[PDB]
Amino acid sequence: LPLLPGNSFNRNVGKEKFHKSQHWGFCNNVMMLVSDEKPGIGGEPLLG
Amino acid sequence: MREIVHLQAGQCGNQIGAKFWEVISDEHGIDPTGTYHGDSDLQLERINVYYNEATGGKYVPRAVLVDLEPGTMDSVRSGPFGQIFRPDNFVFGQSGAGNNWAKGHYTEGAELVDSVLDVVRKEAESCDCLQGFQLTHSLGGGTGSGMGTLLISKIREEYPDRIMNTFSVVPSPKVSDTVVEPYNATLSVHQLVENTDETYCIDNEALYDICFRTLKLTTPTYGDLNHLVSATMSGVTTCLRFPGQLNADLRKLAVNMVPFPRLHFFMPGFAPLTSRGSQQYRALTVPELTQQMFDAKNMMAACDPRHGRYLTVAAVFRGRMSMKEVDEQMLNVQNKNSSYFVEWIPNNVKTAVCDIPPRGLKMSATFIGNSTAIQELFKRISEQFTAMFRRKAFLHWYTGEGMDEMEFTEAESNMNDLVSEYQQYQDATAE
Amino acid sequence: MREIVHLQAGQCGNQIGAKFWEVISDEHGIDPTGTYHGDSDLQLERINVYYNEATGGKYVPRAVLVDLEPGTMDSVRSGPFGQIFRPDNFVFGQSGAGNNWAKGHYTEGAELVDSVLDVVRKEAESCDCLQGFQLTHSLGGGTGSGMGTLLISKIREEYPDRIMNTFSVVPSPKVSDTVVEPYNATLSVHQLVENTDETYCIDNEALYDICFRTLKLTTPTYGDLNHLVSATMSGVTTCLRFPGQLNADLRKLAVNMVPFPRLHFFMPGFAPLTSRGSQQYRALTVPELTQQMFDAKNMMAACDPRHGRYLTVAAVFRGRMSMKEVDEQMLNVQNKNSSYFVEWIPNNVKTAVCDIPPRGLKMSATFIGNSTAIQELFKRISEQFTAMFRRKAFLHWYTGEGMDEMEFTEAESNMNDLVSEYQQYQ
Amino acid sequence: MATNYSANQYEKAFSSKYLQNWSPTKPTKESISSHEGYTQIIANDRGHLLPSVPRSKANPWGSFMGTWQMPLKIPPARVTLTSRTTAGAASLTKWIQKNPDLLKASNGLCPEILGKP
Amino acid sequence: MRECISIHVGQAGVQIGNACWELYCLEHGIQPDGQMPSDGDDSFNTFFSETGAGKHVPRAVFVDLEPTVIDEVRTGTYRQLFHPEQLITGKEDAANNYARGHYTIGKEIIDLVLDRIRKLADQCTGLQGFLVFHSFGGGTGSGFTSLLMERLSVDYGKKSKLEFSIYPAPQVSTAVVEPYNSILTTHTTLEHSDCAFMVDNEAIYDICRRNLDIERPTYTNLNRLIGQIVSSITASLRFDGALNVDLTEFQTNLVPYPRIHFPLATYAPVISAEKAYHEQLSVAEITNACFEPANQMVKCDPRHGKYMACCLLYRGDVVPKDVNAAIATIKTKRTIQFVDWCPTGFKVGINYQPPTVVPGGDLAKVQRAVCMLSNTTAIAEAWARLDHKFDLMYAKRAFVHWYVGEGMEEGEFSEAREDMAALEKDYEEVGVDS
Amino acid sequence: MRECISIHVGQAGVQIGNACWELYCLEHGIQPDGQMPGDDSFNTFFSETGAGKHVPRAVFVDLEPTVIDEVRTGTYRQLFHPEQLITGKEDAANNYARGHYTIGKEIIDLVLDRIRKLADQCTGLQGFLVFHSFGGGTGSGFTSLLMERLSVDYGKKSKLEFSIYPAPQVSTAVVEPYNSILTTHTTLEHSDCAFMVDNEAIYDICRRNLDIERPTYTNLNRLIGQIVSSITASLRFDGALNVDLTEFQTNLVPYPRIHFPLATYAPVISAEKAYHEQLSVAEITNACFEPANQMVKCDPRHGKYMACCLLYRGDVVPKDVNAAIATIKTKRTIQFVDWCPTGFKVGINYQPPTVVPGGDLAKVQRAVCMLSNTTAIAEAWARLDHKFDLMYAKRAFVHWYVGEGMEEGEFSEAREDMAALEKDYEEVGVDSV
Ligand SMILES: Nc1nc2c(ncn2[C@@H]2O[C@H](COP(=O)(O)OP(=O)(O)OP(=O)(O)O)[C@@H](O)[C@H]2O)c(=O)[nH]1
Ligand SMILES: Nc1nc2c(ncn2[C@@H]2O[C@H](COP(=O)(O)OP(=O)(O)OP(=O)(O)O)[C@@H](O)[C@H]2O)c(=O)[nH]1
Ligand SMILES: Nc1nc2c(ncn2[C@@H]2O[C@H](COP(=O)(O)OP(=O)(O)O)[C@@H](O)[C@H]2O)c(=O)[nH]1
Ligand SMILES: Nc1nc2c(ncn2[C@@H]2O[C@H](COP(=O)(O)OP(=O)(O)O)[C@@H](O)[C@H]2O)c(=O)[nH]1
Ligand SMILES: [Mg+2]
Ligand SMILES: [Mg+2]
């Protein structure tokens, strides 16, 4: 399945806990990436 | 030697760009880490078009992600390919647009364009010979419509002698995902007609209808629609980064499909979309790509080309194929239908051929059509705009934020002059 | 190079159409999967006439299936040979016609011609040099007679200089499987006389006669009747896809059959059909074929040629045979019978010879006969249309869909004139 | 949304019966008029119509007829005068003509008359 | 995608619905719980609907004005099959009163009934029509059914509305205001219906006594027979056949004129297991048994009248050649008479699946069967007798205050009697040969 | 960052706050002590502390201790901040004048100080959600000047309202028309959008859908909490396309005097009927338009829809939404005004609703909440005006209001203002030829 139009499937079929953290935010009046150590969606680590 | 800088405006632009960079990372064999894991030697010849080299052999995209509310920006970063974009390329405020063209253009989108053009200048001055700019946005929102046109009008006066390609999600005829779609669409099209070099009108009705009656999916989430749009974007720029027999880049295509300066709205299409249940029933031949390219059900816009006259047509092929078959198929499809092509232009179709087909595919083709039947979109938008505007519906949200009421009337008048130009060039004769 | 596009309308068109593609998939050695499993290399010489080449050596038919209800399309797809058809060629609505001509022509069938002509235009332009079209329907229904005549008048305006064939199942005299049968049968013959090149009249009464006294079948289901029709549809075009000593296509038979453009209603027959008990009591010769071919019990239409005059006659032989014995028998039947043949046309019978017989059989022949005695068919319908119409029975199902009442009186006068064209040549 | 706009080439997929809605249907705008120039403003800031603008005379809230407001003797929906007498079919036309409020309603049973007696 | 909505109104409607839906469940192999044991078949989509958890819910609406008929269904064996809202229940019955069932009590629950009908019809993906099961004599089944069909024709444009009516028997009658309710029903129903298959209890009693050899039948056997009839009608939709009939074709093929939509229903063979051992059941015998006057399921003799149109539906191990031969044998007789303006009098349908056996039943296990819907002129005598009873009761203005004080004016009686008097002349004008 | 401030004023607001914050703790996995058993989706509602303790961004306001002491004593005593529960001394006693002019000025400084202290810790504030009831003395009188001072301090933040409207037949108080008139006359100019419910419609829904013959206020509070969670779920969780708190402010208020939507939720069924019913995307949005499923006792067939907002949660794909919306679009019984040719907004979120233990709703895979602005509210306004001037024609109950601080001309000016409001609705409904 070499990524053609329609050659994809839902990752969200049997998944629960669709959360989202605040990776992007402001600190010291500066646009920043706040943390760099945060889970992806539902507690899952962000691929390394 | 021809770098392309990518602009992603709004949440629609952010999701479509996050799919597009995934698609061409798969095309060039770049892993989600950022390194190169590929087999051919041709995938590294032209990679500076989209990627910047770093220290350690890392290729990072030449894209900037502009938004106002970082919710979709977090959703972009929490994805599969969210770790390849540089964190300095993410630009965001702290207040929502709220589906307001005034909030996107005047009040909240005025303090952010300074940062956006700072980042855009930083990316554009690193290129050895910049080709142009690409933009992804939607005409039914607050940040894509409100600030995307501001970015267009800023970077075009900064860089006049370049090209501007827009992939714009026009309002749907029956979805109506926003109540103030006619206001936002009219006020954005009035800027696009003056400040855009090429516009591609991509519509969600046509995307859904292609995705059922041609691809035969049952549950088409937005990943599939973004994949179709991303395949169109990859097929447009393919001769720039892969060799072939007859090369044609974006400037050449714009030259050969824009005969008058106000006429730069295009219908796209993609050709080998094969059904999930019917792939042993079809053959892979150039006439079978052409028959699907020129099918009226295969356009990515909700307008019927049979209602007007094809001004110009461009076809970009991918794969190893014979030139005689391609030329005779374009000649046959021109000659057999003499009522859907303007008679004062012979040879309405440009052809380009690239050597490398997409991965897992044998042949490919992309169709870009400049047609007079695009006046139906602007006519519907103008009629809905006057139906709302005659009654002062929803006007306080726009007028109480420093917008005069003559702006609406001048936008309507420019849209009506444009559709009059389209009607005149439909009704013109050879004599 | 000479392609034939098959159009199937109705449930009668779909059950005949599904049995037809089962027959010529065995002549060309095509499995239910679709690939080729055969012994001769001559079977693939002319296979582009009926099949479209696909990837991996798979052949799909050039047939479009049209119906206003998927009730019969589901039964076709669940059969043995239901996997060969392209799934984009199935065209179907969601409301039946209800054996009403007005609904199938004006109200319900008017939406469905938007989708059919997208499929017909896709298959017709993919050919190299289109020979002509083909239709299978019934004149006693709502889909076959209603929309099947809407498709004829729409693909003839697009493609005027072609060959239009119809295998139309006319109503039977005593069967009468529809109460409103002559309204649909008269309003459809009025449309066939102006828009069709050749028409083959098939009657279900005559197919019952053959399966009783010739084939001696105790239980003749419609699987066997749709075999008899499909053995004639493949015998007419057998010179298009097989070599011979003297060959004749669809156009060559129509030139030699039709002396005046209104007279194009034929009567088919097949020849070597024999019961299982009398298989060993019969010798295979060309006079054995010519005797059964001209038999009045062997016609597929409920019209007796002994009551009329043979205008023109054709025969399409199959199998290796001598050209003297073929040309001797057609002369011998004309010399004895000087009353059943017209006098201002000498040598009424045309002959064609193919070389490849059907599998497991030594010789064959297909009979096409234009006769004056086909006026028996149009006169027993015009007496039943006029019987119902003067009391105005069942008009509110037709006039209530917008149809004018002068259209009924025009369908009388076009068909009452047609029986007077045939009388003056008897 | 007083107006429904056609999808031009995809209008068949959005027909009323294909979307599983078997009742009658609001009309679809097949053809679109073309204007020329900006639109004069006819309404107030509060949405009120200006004094010079002509107005309609129907109910400002709608034309819905409930169960207890519909006529006691509702006319039929299929009316064919093909086989009736010249006076029997005349009573059918007067029956439909008697109640113009049912024909004008948003629900609006609209019989279609065909034929001659 | 050939769906069909069942609307069972009245006590007769509810009991016939129970007897029908038991047969449907056993035909499609669905438990009383609602789920098929083990078992990708979709043939039940005509009558059932797939919940995602593998449970099938019927496409029927049970309507009543009294709780003690629906409560037996709600606490019976099939208490888990039906949806809770599909069993709609009134509070106080109409009590043999057309005015009560039309204007006062029937005007209340009609919005809820139409809402549930709208939900089912939006669930359906291709709709053949509605089948309304009711009785002319009863207050609910007459009065509520009249305005149900009026508002149903208002809501849905020209869809098929088939009727299964319990006609008043000529001698046996439970009620006494039955002619009043029947006149006031049919006068409204004339312009708002498509076809009305009629069966009455006296003829089915005689059939069940003579043929099935049951000395004391109840309503259960009659409702089983009616369920067999409706299964034979819908078997062409549900199972494949040689040539099959839709739900619109015999609406078109049995109604020759706008005021005449009253066929009669007959089934063959209705024989017991002691006589099925002896009798050979061929194709000709069952279709000769349909045409007999004693086997007719309406207490009327068609030898007085002339057949207008016929519709035959064969099921089982049947070949079309014997059907053709037997139809020719019926046509060549002299005791069966057809009108002169109908030379093509028949319609034929053929199906493969034989009728199923319900345990505890009465009918035998057979290989072939046949149903018939025939339109005769021999119902003008039934209309004349019913108008006799109406006029005889109405000359003294008896039982009239029970309608006048509960909703309707008094001139509606005279207008309905004039409409039926015109219908008599309609039938006699149609029945004259030219 | 995308975060809200909740203001629960009155006994109704406090009980709705209890039912809301129990649900919020359930979705974010916060124990009643206030500590998680990492993820930061709670930052919309809960704010961290250096001791690992999460405190809500809510302010409970009341003029009587007997409703706040239950919060201070019960299960969630360790969760709420001690100064977030502000309690007066004597109640407003069903008096708008007592709640606005005498008792309301004693704690308004403390309430505004606490609101400012919450907004200082807020880094980017979406807006305020005010929960109140029209028919209560505190919930109208104090809420009026609370909205006025919030508009004075915070210039253009979103101030969404969740208001218990007076039910047409069921009613508790007697001066309910006086209180409702006098609070609408001020919130008309000092509100942005007012989502409304009433008790009788939710009683009917809980009776005919959940088969609960004897509901209490707890079931109603849970049903309102589900709606508030469905509104804020686009901020808290990720979706295909999500909706901010400004977007349905802009897309439902066409005119400054017309900001009164109606709320509807679907599917609302029990576990005994979820076994039978199949709840697809089309059926729930066909159920939203049904008048028996409305949460305001009114019939929208007698009116014309001005605008609509749909919010989907769960296992939902976009073309089912599109097809069901077109099926709605092609129905004659649903009518729209003539000047709104694009009427809908659609938002989609991924996480299905969370079931509360001890509750009554069965949990499902998908749900939808509708916020519909329609013309058929002129019935409610005209009936309420009829009750007001019927009571006021002979000066009943007026000495109670006059002796507490207001002039009697305020009654006549408020009645004239809503007399103008009725004309506004009528002239908006009038078509143009
Ligand atoms: N064939 C048949 N007829 C029935 C059955 N039950 C009742 N009937 C007939 O129905 C007639 C009376 O009407 P019902 O159906 O009992 O009652 P209803 O229609 O609900 O009218 P109300 O009692 O006033 O509410 C009687 O004359 C019976 O002939 C049945 O199970 N089978
Ligand atoms: N829906 C709903 N309404 C409530 C609830 N609690 C109280 N109400 C409404 O509140 C109204 C009475 O005012 P309250 O909220 O009890 O008290 P108040 O607003 O503080 O006014 P005062 O008692 O005078 O201080 C009643 O009409 C109820 O409709 C509740 O839990 N749910
Ligand atoms: N093709 C596509 N369209 C999208 C996507 N997300 C949103 N849209 C469209 O964008 C339109 C709304 O634009 P909006 O999100 O308000 O733009 P914004 O205000 O700039 O963020 C809707 O009509 C959607 O159909 C996506 O991922 N793919
Ligand atoms: N020869 C033949 N005739 C058939 C077959 N099926 C049906 N018929 C005849 O077709 C006539 C009616 O066709 P009908 O079903 O109304 O066609 P439709 O309305 O187009 O679906 C009947 O008289 C049947 O005898 C078949 O398989 N073979
Ligand atoms: Mg009863
Ligand atoms: Mg209190």
Numbering used by the authors:
A (entry chain X): 3 to 50
B (entry chain KH): 1 to 431
C (entry chain LH): 1 to 426
D (entry chain m): 1 to 117
E (entry chain LG): 1 to 39, 45 to 439
F (entry chain KG): 1 to 37, 45 to 440
What do the study's own words say?
Cilia are cell-surface organelles with cytoskeletons formed by different microtubule types. These microtubules are decorated inside and out by proteins that alter microtubule stability and elasticity and allow cilia to beat. Among the microtubule-binding proteins identified is SPACA9, which we show is capable of forming both spirals and striations within human ciliary microtubules.
In total, we collected 16,933 useable micrographs, from which we determined a 3.6-Å resolution structure of the 48-nm internal repeat of the DMT. Focused refinements improved the resolution further so that all protofilaments are resolved to between 3.1 and 3.5 Å. In total, we unambiguously identified 33 MIPs. However, we also identified six additional MIPs: C11orf1, CFAP77, C5orf49, FAM166C, FAM183A, and SPACA9. Despite the overall conservation of the MIP repertoire, the tektin-3 homodimer that forms the apex of a pentagonal arrangement of tektin filaments within the A tubule lumen of bovine DMTs is missing in the human DMT. CFAP77 forms a connection between the A and B tubules on the inside of the outer junction, CFAP68 binds at the microtubule seam, and CFAP90 and FAM183A bind to adjacent protofilaments of the B tubule. SPACA9, the single unique component of human respiratory DMTs relative to bovine DMTs, binds in an arc of three proteins to protofilaments B02-B05. The density for SPACA9 between protofilaments B04 and B05 is less well resolved than the two preceding copies, suggesting flexibility or substoichiometric binding.
